[PDB]
Subunit: 125 residues, 2 copies
Amino acid sequence: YPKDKFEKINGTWYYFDSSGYMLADRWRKHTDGNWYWFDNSGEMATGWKKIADKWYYFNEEGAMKTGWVKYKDTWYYLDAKEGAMVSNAFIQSADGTGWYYLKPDGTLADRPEFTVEPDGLITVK
Amino acid sequence: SYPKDKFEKINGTWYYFDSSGYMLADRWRKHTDGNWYWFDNSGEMATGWKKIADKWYYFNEEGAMKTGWVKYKDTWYYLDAKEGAMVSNAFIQSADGTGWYYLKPDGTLADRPEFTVEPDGLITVK
Ligand SMILES: C[C@@H]1COc2c(N3CCN(C)CC3)c(F)cc3c(=O)c(C(=O)O)cn1c23
Protein backbone atom coordinates (compact mmCIF):
# COMPACT_ATOMS: atom_id res chain seq x y z
CA TYR A 1 0.00 0.00 0.00
CA PRO A 2 2.60 2.61 1.14
CA LYS A 3 5.61 3.84 -0.84
CA ASP A 4 8.51 6.23 -0.24
CA LYS A 5 7.26 7.69 3.03
CA PHE A 6 6.66 7.17 6.72
CA GLU A 7 3.64 4.98 7.28
CA LYS A 8 1.77 4.45 10.53
CA ILE A 9 0.53 0.87 10.85
CA ASN A 10 -1.57 -0.20 13.83
CA GLY A 11 -0.35 2.71 15.95
CA THR A 12 3.30 2.19 14.98
CA TRP A 13 5.39 3.99 12.37
CA TYR A 14 7.38 2.34 9.61
CA TYR A 15 9.15 3.56 6.49
CA PHE A 16 8.85 2.19 2.95
CA ASP A 17 11.68 3.20 0.63
CA SER A 18 10.71 4.54 -2.79
CA SER A 19 9.97 0.98 -3.94
CA GLY A 20 7.44 -0.37 -1.45
CA TYR A 21 9.79 -2.17 0.91
CA MET A 22 9.75 -1.29 4.59
CA LEU A 23 13.08 -0.63 6.21
CA ALA A 24 14.06 -3.14 8.92
CA ASP A 25 17.33 -2.85 10.85
CA ARG A 26 18.22 0.13 8.65
CA TRP A 27 19.21 3.79 9.16
CA ARG A 28 17.88 6.47 6.82
CA LYS A 29 18.76 10.11 6.32
CA HIS A 30 15.26 11.47 5.83
CA THR A 31 14.46 14.32 3.46
CA ASP A 32 14.48 16.61 6.53
CA GLY A 33 18.16 16.23 7.38
CA ASN A 34 17.39 14.13 10.46
CA TRP A 35 18.35 10.51 11.01
CA TYR A 36 15.86 7.75 11.74
CA TRP A 37 16.32 4.08 12.59
CA PHE A 38 14.04 1.10 12.21
CA ASP A 39 14.39 -2.06 14.25
CA ASN A 40 14.06 -5.68 13.03
CA SER A 41 10.29 -5.38 12.91
CA GLY A 42 10.37 -2.18 10.89
CA GLU A 43 9.35 -0.03 13.86
CA MET A 44 10.66 3.55 13.95
CA ALA A 45 13.11 4.14 16.79
CA THR A 46 12.03 6.37 19.66
CA GLY A 47 13.94 7.14 22.86
CA TRP A 48 17.32 5.66 23.87
CA LYS A 49 18.15 2.74 21.59
CA LYS A 50 21.32 0.62 21.35
CA ILE A 51 22.29 -0.09 17.75
CA ALA A 52 25.48 -2.06 17.02
CA ASP A 53 27.05 -1.60 20.46
CA LYS A 54 26.55 2.18 20.35
CA TRP A 55 23.80 4.05 22.20
CA TYR A 56 21.62 6.63 20.46
CA TYR A 57 18.73 8.83 21.44
CA PHE A 58 15.70 9.55 19.31
CA ASN A 59 12.96 12.03 20.21
CA GLU A 60 9.26 11.17 20.05
CA GLU A 61 9.21 11.95 16.32
CA GLY A 62 11.91 9.36 15.71
CA ALA A 63 14.60 11.93 14.86
CA MET A 64 18.08 11.18 16.20
CA LYS A 65 19.47 13.71 18.69
CA THR A 66 23.07 14.98 18.81
CA GLY A 67 25.01 17.06 21.31
CA TRP A 68 24.03 17.59 24.92
CA VAL A 69 20.71 16.06 25.88
CA LYS A 70 19.01 15.87 29.26
CA TYR A 71 17.24 12.65 30.23
CA LYS A 72 15.45 12.63 33.59
CA ASP A 73 17.55 15.28 35.34
CA THR A 74 20.86 13.89 34.04
CA TRP A 75 22.95 14.89 31.03
CA TYR A 76 24.53 12.83 28.27
CA TYR A 77 26.41 13.82 25.13
CA LEU A 78 25.70 12.21 21.77
CA ASP A 79 28.41 12.85 19.20
CA ALA A 80 27.50 16.18 17.57
CA LYS A 81 28.57 14.42 14.39
CA GLU A 82 27.68 10.70 14.56
CA GLY A 83 25.08 10.86 17.34
CA ALA A 84 26.49 7.91 19.28
CA MET A 85 26.68 8.46 23.04
CA VAL A 86 30.09 9.38 24.46
CA SER A 87 31.33 7.75 27.66
CA ASN A 88 34.51 7.87 29.80
CA ALA A 89 35.54 11.00 27.93
CA PHE A 90 36.18 14.74 28.30
CA ILE A 91 34.07 17.09 26.15
CA GLN A 92 35.22 20.71 25.77
CA SER A 93 32.72 23.35 26.90
CA ALA A 94 30.94 25.35 24.16
CA ASP A 95 32.88 28.53 24.95
CA GLY A 96 36.09 26.51 24.89
CA THR A 97 36.70 27.52 28.49
CA GLY A 98 36.94 24.01 29.92
CA TRP A 99 35.74 20.41 29.94
CA TYR A 100 32.92 18.17 31.08
CA TYR A 101 33.56 14.54 31.94
CA LEU A 102 31.20 11.79 30.93
CA LYS A 103 31.35 8.75 33.18
CA PRO A 104 31.79 5.28 31.56
CA ASP A 105 27.99 4.91 31.63
CA GLY A 106 27.25 8.05 29.64
CA THR A 107 26.22 10.25 32.59
CA LEU A 108 27.81 13.63 33.25
CA ALA A 109 30.06 13.93 36.29
CA ASP A 110 28.57 16.84 38.26
CA ARG A 111 31.50 16.44 40.63
CA PRO A 112 34.49 14.56 39.07
CA GLU A 113 37.49 13.72 41.27
CA PHE A 114 41.04 13.48 39.93
CA THR A 115 44.31 12.03 41.26
CA VAL A 116 47.61 12.68 39.49
CA GLU A 117 50.43 10.13 39.41
CA PRO A 118 54.08 11.20 39.41
CA ASP A 119 54.26 10.94 35.60
CA GLY A 120 51.12 13.00 35.12
CA LEU A 121 48.62 10.21 34.47
CA ILE A 122 45.10 11.46 35.32
CA THR A 123 42.65 8.96 36.84
CA VAL A 124 39.01 9.99 37.28
CA LYS A 125 36.07 8.80 39.34
CA SER B 1 70.45 14.04 -16.88
CA TYR B 2 67.93 16.01 -14.82
CA PRO B 3 66.81 14.36 -11.51
CA LYS B 4 63.76 12.05 -11.42
CA ASP B 5 62.28 9.62 -8.86
CA LYS B 6 64.76 10.64 -6.14
CA PHE B 7 65.78 12.79 -3.20
CA GLU B 8 68.47 15.10 -4.53
CA LYS B 9 71.02 16.76 -2.26
CA ILE B 10 71.79 20.01 -4.10
CA ASN B 11 74.65 22.01 -2.60
CA GLY B 12 73.13 22.29 0.85
CA THR B 13 69.53 21.17 1.38
CA TRP B 14 67.44 18.13 0.39
CA TYR B 15 64.75 17.96 -2.28
CA TYR B 16 62.68 15.43 -4.17
CA PHE B 17 61.91 15.09 -7.86
CA ASP B 18 59.15 12.72 -8.94
CA SER B 19 59.33 10.36 -11.93
CA SER B 20 58.64 13.13 -14.45
CA GLY B 21 61.34 15.27 -12.89
CA TYR B 22 59.07 17.74 -11.07
CA MET B 23 60.39 19.31 -7.90
CA LEU B 24 57.93 18.76 -5.07
CA ALA B 25 57.18 22.05 -3.29
CA ASP B 26 54.62 23.06 -0.66
CA ARG B 27 53.09 19.59 -0.50
CA TRP B 28 53.43 16.28 1.32
CA ARG B 29 54.94 13.03 0.11
CA LYS B 30 54.60 9.44 1.28
CA HIS B 31 57.86 7.84 0.22
CA THR B 32 58.40 4.20 -0.67
CA ASP B 33 59.73 3.79 2.86
CA GLY B 34 56.30 4.31 4.40
CA ASN B 35 57.30 7.73 5.63
CA TRP B 36 55.70 11.11 4.99
CA TYR B 37 57.86 14.07 4.07
CA TRP B 38 57.11 17.74 3.40
CA PHE B 39 58.83 20.36 1.26
CA ASP B 40 59.20 24.17 1.46
CA ASN B 41 57.82 26.71 -1.00
CA SER B 42 61.35 26.24 -2.33
CA GLY B 43 60.95 22.48 -2.12
CA GLU B 44 63.36 22.05 0.78
CA MET B 45 62.67 18.90 2.77
CA ALA B 46 61.26 19.45 6.25
CA THR B 47 63.34 18.86 9.38
CA GLY B 48 62.33 19.21 13.04
CA TRP B 49 59.17 21.06 13.97
CA LYS B 50 57.23 22.57 11.08
CA LYS B 51 53.90 24.34 11.11
CA ILE B 52 52.08 23.33 7.95
CA ALA B 53 48.63 24.78 7.26
CA ASP B 54 48.08 25.91 10.87
CA LYS B 55 49.10 22.52 12.34
CA TRP B 56 52.37 21.40 13.91
CA TYR B 57 54.37 18.32 12.96
CA TYR B 58 57.76 16.86 13.85
CA PHE B 59 60.18 15.32 11.37
CA ASN B 60 63.36 13.44 12.31
CA GLU B 61 66.86 14.40 11.13
CA GLU B 62 66.03 12.49 7.96
CA GLY B 63 62.75 14.17 7.03
CA ALA B 64 60.42 11.41 8.22
CA MET B 65 57.34 12.75 10.03
CA LYS B 66 56.80 11.22 13.47
CA THR B 67 53.61 10.04 15.20
CA GLY B 68 52.61 9.34 18.77
CA TRP B 69 54.69 10.30 21.79
CA VAL B 70 58.00 12.05 21.19
CA LYS B 71 60.24 13.53 23.87
CA TYR B 72 61.70 16.83 22.70
CA LYS B 73 64.30 18.67 24.77
CA ASP B 74 63.35 16.59 27.83
CA THR B 75 59.62 17.32 27.60
CA TRP B 76 56.93 15.06 26.11
CA TYR B 77 54.65 15.84 23.17
CA TYR B 78 51.94 13.84 21.40
CA LEU B 79 51.70 13.76 17.60
CA ASP B 80 48.50 12.27 16.14
CA ALA B 81 48.73 8.50 15.57
CA LYS B 82 47.75 8.77 11.91
CA GLU B 83 47.59 12.48 11.10
CA GLY B 84 50.79 13.33 12.94
CA ALA B 85 49.63 16.85 13.84
CA MET B 86 50.70 17.96 17.32
CA VAL B 87 47.88 17.60 19.84
CA SER B 88 47.32 20.48 22.27
CA ASN B 89 44.80 21.46 24.95
CA ALA B 90 43.38 17.95 24.93
CA PHE B 91 43.38 14.71 26.96
CA ILE B 92 45.01 11.59 25.53
CA GLN B 93 44.26 8.10 26.93
CA SER B 94 47.26 6.24 28.33
CA ALA B 95 48.26 3.12 26.38
CA ASP B 96 46.60 0.89 29.02
CA GLY B 97 43.30 2.72 29.46
CA THR B 98 44.16 3.46 33.11
CA GLY B 99 43.75 7.23 32.87
CA TRP B 100 44.69 10.26 30.79
CA TYR B 101 47.43 12.74 29.90
CA TYR B 102 46.87 16.43 29.39
CA LEU B 103 48.64 18.32 26.66
CA LYS B 104 48.89 22.05 27.18
CA PRO B 105 47.92 24.63 24.57
CA ASP B 106 51.62 24.78 23.60
CA GLY B 107 51.67 21.03 23.05
CA THR B 108 53.80 20.05 26.05
CA LEU B 109 52.87 17.35 28.57
CA ALA B 110 51.55 18.46 31.96
CA ASP B 111 53.55 17.11 34.92
CA ARG B 112 51.30 18.51 37.64
CA PRO B 113 48.03 19.38 35.87
CA GLU B 114 46.00 21.67 38.16
CA PHE B 115 42.26 20.99 38.39
CA THR B 116 39.30 23.25 39.10
CA VAL B 117 35.68 22.05 39.15
CA GLU B 118 32.72 24.43 38.74
CA PRO B 119 29.29 23.81 40.34
CA ASP B 120 27.73 22.25 37.22
CA GLY B 121 30.80 20.06 36.78
CA LEU B 122 32.84 22.22 34.37
CA ILE B 123 36.54 21.28 34.50
CA THR B 124 39.36 23.82 34.14
CA VAL B 125 42.98 22.76 33.73
CA LYS B 126 45.81 25.13 34.60
C1 LIG C 1 44.13 12.92 -0.88
C2 LIG C 1 45.46 13.44 -0.27
C3 LIG C 1 46.15 12.84 1.01
O1 LIG C 1 47.29 13.65 1.49
C4 LIG C 1 47.20 15.06 1.44
C5 LIG C 1 47.61 15.93 2.52
N1 LIG C 1 48.19 15.46 3.77
C6 LIG C 1 48.99 14.23 3.69
C7 LIG C 1 49.85 14.10 4.98
N2 LIG C 1 48.94 14.07 6.14
C8 LIG C 1 49.75 13.96 7.37
C9 LIG C 1 48.06 15.26 6.21
C10 LIG C 1 47.22 15.35 4.89
C11 LIG C 1 47.45 17.36 2.35
F1 LIG C 1 47.81 18.19 3.31
C12 LIG C 1 46.89 17.89 1.14
C13 LIG C 1 46.50 17.01 0.09
C14 LIG C 1 45.90 17.49 -1.23
O2 LIG C 1 45.74 18.70 -1.44
C15 LIG C 1 45.52 16.45 -2.25
C16 LIG C 1 44.93 16.80 -3.58
O3 LIG C 1 44.64 15.92 -4.39
O4 LIG C 1 44.73 17.97 -3.90
C17 LIG C 1 45.74 15.14 -1.93
N3 LIG C 1 46.28 14.63 -0.78
C18 LIG C 1 46.65 15.58 0.24
